[PDB]
Amino acid sequence: ATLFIADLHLQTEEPAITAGFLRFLQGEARQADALYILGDLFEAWIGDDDPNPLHQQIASAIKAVVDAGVPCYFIHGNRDFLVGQRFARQSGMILLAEEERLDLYGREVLIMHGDTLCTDDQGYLAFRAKVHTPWIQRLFLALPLFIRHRIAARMRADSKAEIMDVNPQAVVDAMERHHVQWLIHGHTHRPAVHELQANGQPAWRVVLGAWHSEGSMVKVTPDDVELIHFPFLEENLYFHHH
Numbered sequence: 001a002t003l004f005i006a007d008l009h010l011q012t013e014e015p016a017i018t019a020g021f022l023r024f025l026q027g028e029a030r031q032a033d034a035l036y037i038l039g040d041l042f043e044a045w046i047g048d049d050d051p052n053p054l055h056q057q058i059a060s061a062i063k064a065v066v067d068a069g070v071p072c073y074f075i076h077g078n079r080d081f082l083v084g085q086r087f088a089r090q091s092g093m094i095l096l097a098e099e100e101r102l103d104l105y106g107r108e109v110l111i112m113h114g115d116t117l118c119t120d121d122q123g124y125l126a127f128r129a130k131v132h133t134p135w136i137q138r139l140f141l142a143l144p145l146f147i148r149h150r151i152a153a154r155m156r157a158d159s160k161a162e163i164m165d166v167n168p169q170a171v172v173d174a175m176e177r178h179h180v181q182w183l184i185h186g187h188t189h190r191p192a193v194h195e196l197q198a199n200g201q202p203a204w205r206v207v208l209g210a211w212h213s214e215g216s217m218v219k220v221t222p223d224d225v226e227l228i229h230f231p232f233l234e235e236n237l238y239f240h241h242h
Ligand SMILES: CN(c1ccccc1C(=O)N1CCc2cc(S(=O)(=O)N3CCN(c4cc(C(F)(F)F)cc(Cl)n4)CC3)ccc21)S(C)(=O)=O
Pocket: 043, 044, 045, 046, 078, 079, 080, 082, 123, 124, 127, 130, 131, 132, 136, 137, 140, 151, 152, 153, 155, 156, 159, 162, 163
């Protein structure tokens, strides 16, 4: 089976999500043919030179899955678009493009974070265009770490002071551009399986969940497609009247 996750939004103030992700990497992921992380692995990223210990702890844990023989792949989210090749090397992950077409047991599947499908959020798309401009990334990454941390903290506060869903036509256009009947994405935090029509045939759009209270993954096998919700930790059973 091939596994997909997204929207973990890891951060040091949420240690329970980190613990659930480490348990996932130590168990379930080790049996996978491959693991794909479709963006928003981290709540924020200001560059690969950041000494945040959470970054090394996560890199080591992913690298152990890779060393155990499970290739791991990453598509950027809107939160963590600055993840680069230094972190790819540290973690053993392979960085992928904004859109990729995969062969999953004979089934053609498009994968992306999903924010580029949210063409009705013009203000998000304006932000995205700015922070994906190469000279703007190069300028930001040149700034001292402590300045970058101050900028990011301020920008997060400003944003906090509701993620828009995908545009249906943008979904059809992406699935027809790639001539696929299957699409897996995250970003909208609305886990679902949607049936639509693309390329003159039934088509499906599978959406991952955010890791709020529990984890979410999509498991693709040669036989089926599974959207799975599971607890972060091993909830031990323990023991009413008639
Ligand atoms: C869907 N969302 C959004 C909706 C509408 C608009 C935006 C978002 C969104 O995605 N936002 C907004 C807040 C924010 C902070 C981070 S960050 O903290 O990781 N970090 C990244 C690197 N970064 C700079 C800064 C600059 C410069 F200074 F030049 F401006 C350039 C460069 Cl190249 N990177 C500093 C901030 C990442 C993403 C987001 S929402 C609700 O927020 O989830």
